[PDB]
Amino acid sequence: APTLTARLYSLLFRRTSTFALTIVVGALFFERAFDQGADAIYEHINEGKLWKHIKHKYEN
Amino acid sequence: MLTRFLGPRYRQLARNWVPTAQLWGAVGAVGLVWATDWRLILDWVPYINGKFK
Amino acid sequence: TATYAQALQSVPETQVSQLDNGLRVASEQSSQPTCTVGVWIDAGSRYESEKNNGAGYFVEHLAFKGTKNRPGNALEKEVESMGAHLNAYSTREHTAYYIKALSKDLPKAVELLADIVQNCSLEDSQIEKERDVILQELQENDTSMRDVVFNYLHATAFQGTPLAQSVEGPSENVRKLSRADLTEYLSRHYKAPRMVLAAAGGLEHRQLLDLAQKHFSGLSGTYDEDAVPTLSPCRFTGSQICHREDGLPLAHVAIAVEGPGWAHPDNVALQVANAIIGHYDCTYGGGAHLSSPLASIAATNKLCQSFQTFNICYADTGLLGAHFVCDHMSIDDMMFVLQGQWMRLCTSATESEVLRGKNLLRNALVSHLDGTTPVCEDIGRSLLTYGRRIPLAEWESRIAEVDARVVREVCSKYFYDQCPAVAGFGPIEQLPDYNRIRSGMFWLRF
């Protein structure tokens, strides 16, 4: 039983190759998860959007 | 005349740096892809399907 | 044509024995008319506390100044008169007393060692006379930049541990250490099972065993109940000690990472790597053409006056690095290059350089064990550390196993992205900041 940060260090941080690979792969997900999670926060507090407003007009 | 770099030691040098050069391409590919939002390439990653269809 | 390989098998086996004492008696017979004998004890500043630090060093002074059976200068005259030589030394983990002598003088040589090791008089007037001699050696030592810099290196690398301390101790211990402190340190440590009676030359194992039984039986006729002779591991610390002194004409600098310790097989590959890097001195013939890139660049660009790599080993820990001497405006370049070489070996070592490093170790190994004294010291201390002798041939197989991969991996392990211990003395304004040194321990392209 080593620790987490240790595992992370051994497998990914030691080399600048992996270190860099890990962060670019980290940004790809962070951006996607931050945008989503953050939009939903923006929406939940508002709700006088163009969204809910739409619902009213699938017609023409 | 580039034959100065042709020999056993240079071949061992080339080898020791292959993984590094490989992993640098990994970083460059993923990085180019993610900065331009490569529609083509990305559509295949499970999550990151923030383009519905 | 006996091949090198063949000659390694020709080296006679080291014979080992044990008295009921626990005293190990070891020899390597060779048919010389001369020999070396002495006793190796594992006692040294690392076993000492803050309070008695410098104790063993104090005993080493007293050691040859009178026993019970031969008080005052009687020792000297017995040795001097046979033409023998009587020496002693103490490191942080080891102490030794040995005699170089005509082979047919083995009997008395041995008789003498026992007497020294057991019946040391420690006459109150002598210890007082020695108080001032040691103090004086201290002033003496303060002028050897190199000695001072490794003492600093140990002091910062092992900062809160016993290995941080020096062998001679601080001046105040020399001032206050009393006879009782010595006798207690002796009783505590000069005990059979931690002593090895070693010899090399024109002797025969049985004679040495007989003598060991004759003059040494009766040391652990006691043996302690709960005493506490155990060695605790020593914390290594990534740190820096800078003793700035612009009045000194050249800078001394010693960097090291944490070594593994006497027992670890990794030591063979580390030394091979260290040989590749080498050492250098401004009196070396041919500089620009030297194999070692550090060495050759240092010679062409005058970055250095000297430098050497090193692998100090202690139990379970050690200092692995290099020390160098240079002008005030070259410390930065010397570090840049020294560090480039470790990195290069970590990630990029080639095959022919490893072969050169390997051969360099073979020649060094063999060149060293030449003559009774060095072989004796090797028998004596090997038994302390490895427990056995480790014959030339075994070392040869270890060395043979090392190739580029082994160098890369073994170097990476101890060097790569590791916090070093830095010691510096002198005109060191240009010595790089620690963060900067620390960043030199990894490569951003890797």
Curated annotation (Swiss-Prot), chain A:
It comes from the Eukaryota. The chain crosses the membrane at residues 20-45. One of its GO terms (biological process) is mitochondrial electron transport, ubiquinol to cytochrome c. Its main location: mitochondrion. Pfam families: UCR_UQCRX_QCR9. Keywords: Electron transport, Membrane, Mitochondrion, Mitochondrion inner membrane, Respiratory chain, Transmembrane, Transmembrane helix, Transport. GO terms for cellular component: mitochondrial inner membrane; respiratory chain complex III. Residues 46-60 are mitochondrial intermembrane. It is found in: Mitochondrion inner membrane. The keyword Electron transport applies. InterPro entries: QCR9, QCR9_sf. Residues 1-19 are mitochondrial matrix. It is a single-pass membrane protein. The keyword Signal does not apply. Component of the ubiquinol-cytochrome c oxidoreductase, a multisubunit transmembrane complex that is part of the mitochondrial electron transport chain which drives oxidative phosphorylation. Component of the ubiquinol-cytochrome c oxidoreductase (cytochrome b-c1 complex, complex III, CIII), a multisubunit enzyme composed of 11 subunits. The complex is composed of 3 respiratory subunits cytochrome b, cytochrome c1 and Rieske protein UQCRFS1, 2 core protein subunits UQCRC1/QCR1 and UQCRC2/QCR2, and 6 low-molecular weight protein subunits UQCRH/QCR6, UQCRB/QCR7, UQCRQ/QCR8, UQCR10/QCR9, UQCR11/QCR10 and subunit 9, the cleavage product of Rieske protein UQCRFS1. Belongs to the UQCR10/QCR9 family. PANTHER family: CYTOCHROME B-C1 COMPLEX SUBUNIT 9 (PTHR12980:SF0), UBIQUINOL-CYTOCHROME C REDUCTASE COMPLEX, SUBUNIT X (PTHR12980). This is Cytochrome b-c1 complex subunit 9. It comes from Bos taurus (Bovine).
From Swiss-Prot, chain B:
The lineage of its organism: Eukaryota, Metazoa, Chordata, Craniata, Vertebrata. GO terms for cellular component: mitochondrial inner membrane; respiratory chain complex III. PANTHER family: CYTOCHROME B-C1 COMPLEX SUBUNIT 10, UBIQUINOL-CYTOCHROME C REDUCTASE COMPLEX 6.4 KD PROTEIN. It comes from Bos taurus. The chain crosses the membrane at residues 13-35. One of its GO terms (biological process) is mitochondrial electron transport, ubiquinol to cytochrome c. Belongs to the UQCR11/QCR10 family. It comes from the Eukaryota. Pfam families: UCR_6-4kD (PF08997). Component of the ubiquinol-cytochrome c oxidoreductase, a multisubunit transmembrane complex that is part of the mitochondrial electron transport chain which drives oxidative phosphorylation. Residues 1-12 are mitochondrial matrix. It is found in: Mitochondrion inner membrane. The keyword Nucleotide-binding does not apply. Component of the ubiquinol-cytochrome c oxidoreductase (cytochrome b-c1 complex, complex III, CIII), a multisubunit enzyme composed of 11 subunits. The complex is composed of 3 respiratory subunits cytochrome b, cytochrome c1 and Rieske protein UQCRFS1, 2 core protein subunits UQCRC1/QCR1 and UQCRC2/QCR2, and 6 low-molecular weight protein subunits UQCRH/QCR6, UQCRB/QCR7, UQCRQ/QCR8, UQCR10/QCR9, UQCR11/QCR10 and subunit 9, the cleavage product of Rieske protein UQCRFS1. Keywords: Electron transport, Membrane, Mitochondrion, Mitochondrion inner membrane, Respiratory chain, Transmembrane, Transmembrane helix, Transport. This is Cytochrome b-c1 complex subunit 10. It is a single-pass membrane protein. Residues 36-53 are mitochondrial intermembrane. Disulfide bonds: none annotated.
UniProtKB/Swiss-Prot annotation, chain C:
GO terms for cellular component: mitochondrial inner membrane; mitochondrion. The keyword Acetylation applies. It comes from the Eukaryota. It is a peripheral membrane protein. The modification Phosphoserine is found at residue 178. Disulfide bonds: none annotated. Pfam families: Peptidase_M16, Peptidase_M16_C. The modification N6-succinyllysine is found at residue 129. Keywords: Acetylation, Electron transport, Membrane, Mitochondrion, Mitochondrion inner membrane, Phosphoprotein, Respiratory chain, Transit peptide, Transport. GO terms for molecular function: metal ion binding. It is found in: Mitochondrion inner membrane. The modification N6-acetyllysine is found at residues 77, 104, 129, 214. Its main location: mitochondrion. InterPro entries: Metalloenz_LuxS/M16 (IPR011249), MPP/UQCRC_Complex (IPR050361), Pept_M16_N (IPR011765), Peptidase_M16_C (IPR007863). Component of the ubiquinol-cytochrome c oxidoreductase, a multisubunit transmembrane complex that is part of the mitochondrial electron transport chain which drives oxidative phosphorylation. Component of the ubiquinol-cytochrome c oxidoreductase (cytochrome b-c1 complex, complex III, CIII), a multisubunit enzyme composed of 11 subunits. The complex is composed of 3 respiratory subunits cytochrome b, cytochrome c1 and Rieske protein UQCRFS1, 2 core protein subunits UQCRC1/QCR1 and UQCRC2/QCR2, and 6 low-molecular weight protein subunits UQCRH/QCR6, UQCRB/QCR7, UQCRQ/QCR8, UQCR10/QCR9, UQCR11/QCR10 and subunit 9, the cleavage product of Rieske protein UQCRFS1. Belongs to the peptidase M16 family. UQCRC1/QCR1 subfamily. This is Cytochrome b-c1 complex subunit 1, mitochondrial. It comes from Bos taurus (Bovine).
